[PDB]
């Protein structure tokens, strides 16, 4: 309790005093510059009238003119002139005209699409780095290809050459792969895009590769950026339709990836992570190196490792009353870290029947049996016996 408070002490005072400051300061910002700034405001105001007719920029010709196509429909041969530059104007941007004579009075707008919402994440994970605990030899591997050449470029010029491009995290289910992508991206504070590979298939034909253009068009502007393609195993035999998604599309989406990630485009400075549960499902040319470099293989966590993973989950819990925690790990052999999170889930479910608020040691032993029974089928030892 008194440890919690020390943290709670700094947090309250400092930000709430800054809030009280910013509130008073809204006024105060105007006061030191009110004759450069209101002078500028005046001159801005005078040329552009009201309203500001928004058009969408098709293209500029570099000579101080442009062709715009408004949404209100008419096309106009505008001038690039006044409070606007040729470098600020790039296709697909939304430009500000003055209504009565279309002169480009500025640009204040580039994005407003529903599409780009999809790619970005407003994320807040409940497990951050150092709740990836154990398998530390191989977290060290994802660091070297994602985290550490962002954090020090020093090391990758001290060795010379390029920093290795991308990675594939692959192996058995439950091995903590998801939590890796979300947690290494916590460390860096890079833009975490996330798209699934069951969302890379589309219910419209030939829109699938257009979507795959969107992922690294987004990546490239918000860079440095970490693009998670989660579950790209779903490319080989999982598809929404056949006469309006079809066979053509599945192959095309993969062709599209090639051009994005090491085509002319090249698109340097996007770290790519691909989680896939089977790398023998994946395309031979997407498991070509030099767009995803080295592969990291994970396996069902080993006997000492599952100590780590049991401590991560039972730190939340009220602990064992008699303690048999060290023997739980021993009984399990060749088993996932997802079995460990389903075991502390299962212990507190048995506890949840009572609608008691404590948890005791004995629930652990029961809960392990319950969830092992669920795994094993009646035709496995039907087929066998």
């Amino acid at each position: 309790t008194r440890c919690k408070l020390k943290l709670l002490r700094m947090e309250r005072i400092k930000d709430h005093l800054l809030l009280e400051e910013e509130f008073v300061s809204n006024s105060e910002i105007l006061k030191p510059f009110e004759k450069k700034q209101e002078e500028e405001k005046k001159q801005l105001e005078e040329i552009r009238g009201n309203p500001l007719s928004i058009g969408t920029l098709e293209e500029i010709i570099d000579d101080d003119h442009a062709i715009v196509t408004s949404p209100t429909m008419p096309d106009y041969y505008v001038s690039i002139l006044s409070f606007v530059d040729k470098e600020l104007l790039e296709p697909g941007c939304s430009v500000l005209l003055h209504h009565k004579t279309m002169s480009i009075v500025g640009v204040l707008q580039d994005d407003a699409d529903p599409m780009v919402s999809v790619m970005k994440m407003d994320k807040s994970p409940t497990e951050s780095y150092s709740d990836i605990g154990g398998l530390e030899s191989q977290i060290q591997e994802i660091k070297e290809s994602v985290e550490l050449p962002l954090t020090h470029p020093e090391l990758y010029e001290e060795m010379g050459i390029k920093p290795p491009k991308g990675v594939i995290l692959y192996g058995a289910p439950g091995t903590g792969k998801t939590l890796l992508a979300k947690a290494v991206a916590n460390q860096t504070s890079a833009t975490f895009l996330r798209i699934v590979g069951s969302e890379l298939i589309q219910k419209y034909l030939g829109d699938g590769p257009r979507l795959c253009r969107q992922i690294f068009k987004v990546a490239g502007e918000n860079a440095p950026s970490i693009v998670f393609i989660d579950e790209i195993d779903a490319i080989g035999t999982k598809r929404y339709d056949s006469n309006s998604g079809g066979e053509r599309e599945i192959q095309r989406t993969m062709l599209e990836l090639l051009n994005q990630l090491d085509g002319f485009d090249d698109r340097g400075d996007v770290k790519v992570i691909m989680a896939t549960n089977k790398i023998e499902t994946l395309d031979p040319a997407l498991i070509r190196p030099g767009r995803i470099d080295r592969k990291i293989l994970f396996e069902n966590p080993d006997l000492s490792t599952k100590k780590k993973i049991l401590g991560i989950h039972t730190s939340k819990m009220n602990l064992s009353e008699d303690v048999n925690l060290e023997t739980l790990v021993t009984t399990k052999d060749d088993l996932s870290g997802a079995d460990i999170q389903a075991m502390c889930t299962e212990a507190g479910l048995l506890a949840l029947r009572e609608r008691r608020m404590q948890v005791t040691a004995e629930d652990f032993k029961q809960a392990k049996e319950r969830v092992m029974k669920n795994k094993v089928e009646e035709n496995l030892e039907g087929l066998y016996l």
Partner: protein, 238 residues
């Protein structure tokens, strides 16, 4: 890939039906073989499905084919059952021809032979059973251990493990075992077997079953009590 059928080859050169046949072996009970110098011990996990299961009349996982060759299996129990009977008609027949008892080297070929035959053909599936055949020769007293696999390929190993998490026992075995000196006392060699089998049962001393072959047509099945004493030695030291 090219699992639609057995006879068609594969770009990858691996007949899929054999590969999946192996996978089936992992279903069944673990069996381990360890040779001595004067012994072979052939032990197997005897996994108990329910407490209503008899020990009165219910089959052991280890089957003597003839009176000095012993056989365990791992795999599809249904399939093993005819494989063991076919092995046996030939085995006995070996004496009809020669007036010599069954040699372990002739026997592994034969068991691999019925299996190879089934694979070669197209209108049968392979046996989903890998077997360990342990024994000594009639003529001589050096311990012999063989394996057959689904494929129809046979090998000799010093000690070898198959079925139910075979990998983990295999590694265990490497570390413990010595090829310079295999144990030359029947008891210590048994003890190595028990330690292996402990692992896959997790807990049991009524689910570890040990059988031993010794030379000159000695085959014995060990008392449930006798195995528990060995487990007692292994738990104390640990």
């Amino acid at each position: 890939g090219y699992d639609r059928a057995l006879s068609i080859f594969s770009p990858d050169g691996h007949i899929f039906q054999v590969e999946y046949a192996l996978e089936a072996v992992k279903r069944g009970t673990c069996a381990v073989g360890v040779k001595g110098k004067n012994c072979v011990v052939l032990g197997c996990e005897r996994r108990s499905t329910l407490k209503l299961q008899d020990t009165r009349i219910t089959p052991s996982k280890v089957s003597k084919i003839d009176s000095h060759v012993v056989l365990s299996f791992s795999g599809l129990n249904a399939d093993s059952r005819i494989l063991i009977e076919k092995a046996r008609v030939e085995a006995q027949s070996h004496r009809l021809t020669l007036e010599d008892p069954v040699t372990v080297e002739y026997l592994t070929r034969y068991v691999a032979g019925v299996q190879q035959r089934y694979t070669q053909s197209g209108g049968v599936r392979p046996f989903g059973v890998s077997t360990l055949i342990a024994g000594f020769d009639p003529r001589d007293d050096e311990p012999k251990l063989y394996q057959t696999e689904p494929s129809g390929i046979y090998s000799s190993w010093s000690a070898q493990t198959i079925g139910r998490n075979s990998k983990t026992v295999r590694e265990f075995l490497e570390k413990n075992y010595d090829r310079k000196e295999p144990p030359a006392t029947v008891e210590e060699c048994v003890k190595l077997t028990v330690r292996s089998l402990l692992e896959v049962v997790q807990t049991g001393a009524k689910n570890i079953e040990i059988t031993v072959v010794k030379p000159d047509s000695d085959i014995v099945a060990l008392s449930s009590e006798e195995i528990n004493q060995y487990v007692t030695q292994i738990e104390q030291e640990k």
